[PDB]
Amino acid sequence: SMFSRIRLATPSDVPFIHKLIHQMAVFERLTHLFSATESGLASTLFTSRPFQSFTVFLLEVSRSPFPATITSSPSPDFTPFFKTHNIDDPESYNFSPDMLNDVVVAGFVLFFPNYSSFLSKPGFYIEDIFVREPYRRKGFGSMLLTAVAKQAVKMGYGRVEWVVLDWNVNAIKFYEQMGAQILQEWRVCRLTGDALEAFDQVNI
Amino acid sequence: SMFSRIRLATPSDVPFIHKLIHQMAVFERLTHLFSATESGLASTLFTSRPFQSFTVFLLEVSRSPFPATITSSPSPDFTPFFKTHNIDDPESYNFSPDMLNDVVVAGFVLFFPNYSSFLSKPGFYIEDIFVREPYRRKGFGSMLLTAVAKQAVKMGYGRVEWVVLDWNVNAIKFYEQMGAQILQEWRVCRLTGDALEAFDQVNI
């Protein structure tokens, strides 16, 4: 048996969030895009309460059962999610929130509220899901997505949204099986870098 | 001369936000999607400070100059944006935040923070821009977009993002002229309605 739990991240989890983002960049061969720092994460991710703005769920695993609750959870609207599964992790020591306890961080989902004007209802947008290598091929990416959807339902939020690569045919079919719809008409536009910084010069 | 100003919305602006969203739905022939209420907007849009979560800039117009400042602005990171332009508005009385003053609300942009994991930096996502009919064909939609970009630069945010219709060739060219990039590989996925509500039944 391997036990898993999904909980809310708090400021003390910044080292693990930093390392998970780095491993995600390594996995994607995108480390040239990585400039995240622990200070940057610590000063930006936790300026609001969970679900108020940026929110991170952490996936943790253990060979022994987790506690049934988290009494110190940073939100009153959240109780952890759990699953039991029927493994060598050399990086365990860099992912243990309590060095003496047999629990390691295995993945994360980062999400934040979006909004539907026509409904006057918030929803969630999922920005990143990443599961580190020893825990891959076990369905944990889907478990983290499911956790965000379940939280949206508990809170009465209107929609959960994310993006998918046009060619990722297997993920598209997976999302459709869940009842999600791929909105074929929209394209994402991004203003960044020197192009964004040039707006400093507009006389308004 | 017509003077314009872009300021932060506050809870007292809920009636105008409600009516602007409604006019946007009427304009798009999408009123069958409109279920927004003043109470819903009032209880969801203002649970955080400006730029912390959902944020609305309001465009206002006047035949006389605006004050140079807003001392009661709900954010210390914001000063209003202004433009002078070289008109019959029957709906003026439904859009005047102070009935005796010669100022009317003409449009809005609704946006909220997004996040780049690789940068550990927030950005802004623009959800809606709408300018009501007597003030259309005057460049105010671009002015509202510019306001969000300028605010991102002032705050050191990393990117501004939005979506565009694949066939909206003129808007695409406009966004490219500004230096934005259309990311052709991504498609938006949406989980909503009974499909979302079904996640209540997942045993995690």
Side-chain angles (χ1 to χ4, degrees):
Chain A
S1 270
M2 179 172 61
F3 301 90
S4 67
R5 181 186 66 191
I6 294 172
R7 69 172 169 84
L8 278 163
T10 67
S12 61
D13 295 308
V14 160
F16 312 119
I17 297 166
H18 187 248
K19 288 182 184 65
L20 284 171
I21 295 165
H22 187 256
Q23 292 208 359
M24 175 174 72
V26 169
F27 185 90
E28 295 296 326
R29 310 292 313 257
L30 291 176
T31 68
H32 52 281
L33 301 181
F34 182 91
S35 58
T37 60
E38 287 193 11
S39 285
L41 292 163
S43 66
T44 55
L45 280 181
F46 301 97
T47 56
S48 307
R49 293 182 183 174
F51 318 119
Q52 181 175 16
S53 189
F54 317 119
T55 305
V56 171
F57 284 161
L58 293 173
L59 168 76
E60 288 166 315
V61 297
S62 183
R63 294 268 310 266
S64 41
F66 281 91
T69 61
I70 301 179
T71 59
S72 59
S73 171
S75 177
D77 300 328
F78 180 81
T79 49
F81 303 108
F82 299 90
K83 184 143 190 164
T84 301
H85 316 258
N86 290 300
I87 306 126
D88 105 280
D89 185 5
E91 275 289 304
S92 67
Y93 64 98
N94 284 321
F95 292 98
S96 53
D98 297 280
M99 289 311 303
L100 311 186
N101 194 26
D102 67 329
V103 167
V104 299
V105 170
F108 80 112
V109 53
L110 184 140
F111 62 105
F112 42 82
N114 63 7
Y115 202 83
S116 164
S117 300
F118 285 163
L119 299 180
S120 65
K121 285 220 181 145
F124 287 138
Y125 182 83
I126 298 171
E127 171 63 20
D128 283 307
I129 296 180
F130 185 67
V131 175
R132 65 182 185 87
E133 194 151 53
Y135 309 106
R136 295 186 66 82
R137 308 187 280 109
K138 291 163 189 68
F140 282 130
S142 170
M143 188 186 174
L144 285 157
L145 172 51
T146 294
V148 176
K150 282 185 73 63
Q151 191 64 26
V153 176
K154 287 177 177 213
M155 299 180 70
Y157 280 23
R159 331 189 144 157
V160 182
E161 291 185 347
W162 58 91
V163 293
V164 65
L165 289 166
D166 184 52
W167 65 76
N168 192 348
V169 167
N170 48 279
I172 286 166
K173 173 94 215 93
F174 184 73
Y175 298 141
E176 288 173 338
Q177 287 170 334
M178 290 178 1
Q181 292 175 119
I182 282 80
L183 312 181
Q184 283 289 350
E185 67 266 38
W186 295 110
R187 301 287 182 278
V188 171
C189 302
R190 178 185 290 167
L191 181 62
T192 195
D194 289 350
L196 175 57
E197 261 276 340
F199 276 78
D200 202 28
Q201 287 122 239
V202 179
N203 194 28
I204 249 84
Chain B
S1 270
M2 179 172 61
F3 301 90
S4 67
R5 181 186 66 191
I6 294 172
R7 69 172 169 84
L8 278 163
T10 67
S12 61
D13 295 308
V14 160
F16 312 119
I17 297 166
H18 187 248
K19 288 182 184 65
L20 284 171
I21 295 165
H22 187 256
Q23 292 208 359
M24 175 174 72
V26 169
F27 185 90
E28 295 296 326
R29 310 292 313 257
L30 291 176
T31 68
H32 52 281
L33 301 181
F34 182 91
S35 58
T37 60
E38 287 193 11
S39 285
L41 292 163
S43 66
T44 55
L45 280 181
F46 301 97
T47 56
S48 307
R49 293 182 183 174
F51 318 119
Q52 181 175 16
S53 189
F54 317 119
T55 305
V56 171
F57 284 161
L58 293 173
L59 168 76
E60 288 166 315
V61 297
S62 183
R63 294 268 310 266
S64 41
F66 281 91
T69 61
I70 301 179
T71 59
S72 59
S73 171
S75 177
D77 300 328
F78 180 81
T79 49
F81 303 108
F82 299 90
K83 184 143 190 164
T84 301
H85 316 258
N86 290 300
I87 306 126
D88 105 280
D89 185 5
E91 275 289 304
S92 67
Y93 64 98
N94 284 321
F95 292 98
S96 53
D98 297 280
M99 289 311 303
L100 311 186
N101 194 26
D102 67 329
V103 167
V104 299
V105 170
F108 80 112
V109 53
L110 184 140
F111 62 105
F112 42 82
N114 63 7
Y115 202 83
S116 164
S117 300
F118 285 163
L119 299 180
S120 65
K121 285 220 181 145
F124 287 138
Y125 182 83
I126 298 171
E127 171 63 20
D128 283 307
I129 296 180
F130 185 67
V131 175
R132 65 182 185 87
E133 194 151 53
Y135 309 106
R136 295 186 66 82
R137 308 187 280 109
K138 291 163 189 68
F140 282 130
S142 170
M143 188 186 174
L144 285 157
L145 172 51
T146 294
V148 176
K150 282 185 73 63
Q151 191 64 26
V153 176
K154 287 177 177 213
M155 299 180 70
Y157 280 23
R159 331 189 144 157
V160 182
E161 291 185 347
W162 58 91
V163 293
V164 65
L165 289 166
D166 184 52
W167 65 76
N168 192 348
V169 167
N170 48 279
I172 286 166
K173 173 94 215 93
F174 184 73
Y175 298 141
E176 288 173 338
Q177 287 170 334
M178 290 178 1
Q181 292 175 119
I182 282 80
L183 312 181
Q184 283 289 350
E185 67 266 38
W186 295 110
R187 301 287 182 278
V188 171
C189 302
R190 178 185 290 167
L191 181 62
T192 195
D194 289 350
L196 175 57
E197 261 276 340
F199 276 78
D200 202 28
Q201 287 122 239
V202 179
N203 194 28
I204 249 84

